Amino acid sequence: SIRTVGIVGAGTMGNGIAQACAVVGLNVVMVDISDAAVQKGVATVASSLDRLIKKEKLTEADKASALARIKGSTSYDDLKATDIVIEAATENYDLKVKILKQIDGIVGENVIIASNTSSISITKLAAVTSRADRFIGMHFFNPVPVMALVELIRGLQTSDTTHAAVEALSKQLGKYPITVKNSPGFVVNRILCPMINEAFCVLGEGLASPEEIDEGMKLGCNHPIGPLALADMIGLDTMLAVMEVLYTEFADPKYRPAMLMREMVAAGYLGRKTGRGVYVYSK
Amino acid sequence: SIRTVGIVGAGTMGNGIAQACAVVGLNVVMVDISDAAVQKGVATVASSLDRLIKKEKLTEADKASALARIKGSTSYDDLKATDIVIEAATENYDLKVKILKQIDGIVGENVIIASNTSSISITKLAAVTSRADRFIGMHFFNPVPVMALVELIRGLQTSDTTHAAVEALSKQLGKYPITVKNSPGFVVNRILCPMINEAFCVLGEGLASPEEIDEGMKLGCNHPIGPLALADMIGLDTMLAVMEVLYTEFADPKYRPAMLMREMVAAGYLGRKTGRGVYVYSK
Ligand SMILES: CC(=O)CC(=O)SCCNC(=O)CCNC(=O)[C@H](O)C(C)(C)COP(=O)(O)OP(=O)(O)OC[C@H]1O[C@@H](n2cnc3c(N)ncnc32)[C@H](O)[C@@H]1OP(=O)(O)O
Numbered sequence A, B: 001s002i003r004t005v006g007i008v009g010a011g012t013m014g015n016g017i018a019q020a021c022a023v024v025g026l027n028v029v030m031v032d033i034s035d036a037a038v039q040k041g042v043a044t045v046a047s048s049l050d051r052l053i054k055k056e057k058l059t060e061a062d063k064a065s066a067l068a069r070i071k072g073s074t075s076y077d078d079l080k081a082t083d084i085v086i087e088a089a090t091e092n093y094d095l096k097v098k099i100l101k102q103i104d105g106i107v108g109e110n111v112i113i114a115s116n117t118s119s120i121s122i123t124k125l126a127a128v129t130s131r132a133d134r135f136i137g138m139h140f141f142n143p144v145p146v147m148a149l150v151e152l153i154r155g156l157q158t159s160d161t162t163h164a165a166v167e168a169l170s171k172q173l174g175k176y177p178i179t180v181k182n183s184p185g186f187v188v189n190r191i192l193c194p195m196i197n198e199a200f201c202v203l204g205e206g207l208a209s210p211e212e213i214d215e216g217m218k219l220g221c222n223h224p225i226g227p228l229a230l231a232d233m234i235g236l237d238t239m240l241a242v243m244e245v246l247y248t249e250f251a252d253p254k255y256r257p258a259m260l261m262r263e264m265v266a267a268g269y270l271g272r273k274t275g276r277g278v279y280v281y282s283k
């Protein structure tokens, strides 16, 4: 069984995963490059725990009982303690290779190595490690504490065993796991993002105003947020990049990025993270 | 002002519109081909009114006060009484022409003629009537009583005046109105349907199971219903047709129907309305 989870990366995501494993009882060995980054990782887990204490959730005795389980190191032989390591540091391909290569040097043949992503080919990664059959892709969703789902992405090489284990691990963490053969955009992004794109196409064409496009979809398909407002939340540079991956990996102009999405990105109007995108925001 | 609404058609939609105008205070002149169809139209309006009485909504004195306002005829000079007629009988193009041609013979130059649709070119219609500038497209959503939105679709010829009037009419009826230049799929269907299609593409490709695709989108994008389950609700033959219109009207394989959606349709697996589609249902 998997009693001890490895985690390389202590940023937004890695805190997420770690917490999600701790508030359950699994031992996390978290790892990063400085002690500063590591404790900043712990501060966030605690801080988020104290929100839950506040809205009558959990207890004061779990904020405690969890953290005990988080062994947060800056050395990487520490990960031998683990049954599985999840890389959660980077969407940079060449850095990812190194990290996984290094993780692959430390732990034993039978340990599973995972890698969080939204865009990187799981098959292309798995192939850089010693045991490719022991590699699997994961993709958690962005406020990891509360979101109850993971895309589990099988490289061409991932084994049935490697799958079932991490299938079960996810189920323990309290999320429903989707299973997906490695493909550009996996499942969620594959269908969600080309829709966001189609909203930009519609707005580009002069067919309707942004606020009315967004309301159309809200009221018409009872979506929580309209795709444009949503695009502003995700990041229009994050959107363009996904569409570029879609178009490039499938080599099909079906996934042509919208031209207005290109223009906004060139202008720097990237959304909420710059105050201006489809809509204007404060700061 | 528009005190008296014309309605040709007493099926699902026309009952909808009529009610929506009555529960507000506008006089409806409803019209169909038999007396049977007309009263069946009234039975449904009443029946739906009695649900609202039941869940502590409205009153017993509005179930009454509304119906008074519904003048439900089988002659078509009755529509001279009206400030506007809304055609709500048919998605058959050649029948639609006739009806609008006939409606156009009865009412005066300055009366507005609308036409409900999801697929028919508003410009192509408007052009068959005497006053094209007085034509506008409407598209209500399917349980008209409760859905708070209409797509208002300007043919190339619709006037600014014709627009503002029917803009206001919609606002009275209690819906937010979207405004859209006539284009294949208008707004909602234009972006929603190619997404449903992309789910069929994903399932066709062997990437993931239908139930997990659907859950991915539910949990991942907090959508109420997954697109596949949704496709089963809409009708897979209704989906294929929309995609065919998209592909045919834009003349762009970007909107290629999914091949599995074609196959299911050929097999007769059309969804909930036949008991079998993506999923199997009872009967
Ligand atoms: C026409 C074309 O060519 C193409 C098109 O179709 S374009 C328009 C189609 N687009 C669509 O999105 C259609 C489907 N609509 C949706 O999915 C909407 O987002 C939505 C209205 C369903 C969202 O609402 P939701 O949060 O899922 O509420 P939902 O529960 O589904 O509402 C339906 C009601 O029917 C009721 N109902 C009636 N009979 C019932 C039964 N036998 N069993 C269970 N529920 C029943 C339910 O109780 C429910 O009301 P409450 O939940 O308030 O009690």
Ligand SMILES: CC(=O)CC(=O)SCCNC(=O)CCNC(=O)[C@H](O)C(C)(C)COP(=O)(O)OP(=O)(O)OC[C@H]1O[C@@H](n2cnc3c(N)ncnc32)[C@H](O)[C@@H]1OP(=O)(O)O
Binding pocket: A118, A141, A142, A188, A189, A224, A225, A234, A238, A242, B220, B221, B222, B223
């Ligand atoms: C990574 C990639 O490359 C590509 C991708 O991004 S793929 C994944 C992205 N996909 C997404 O769908 C991202 C966006 N997610 C969604 O829209 C989800 O459907 C959703 C979680 C927002 C749906 O939930 P919802 O019904 O809209 O709830 P919502 O209110 O938005 O939840 C956010 C919480 O933040 C809270 N919040 C925190 N600070 C706040 C503030 N200053 N003001 C207001 N609210 C605040 C809110 O209170 C809210 O909780 P409650 O409503 O329960 O109080």
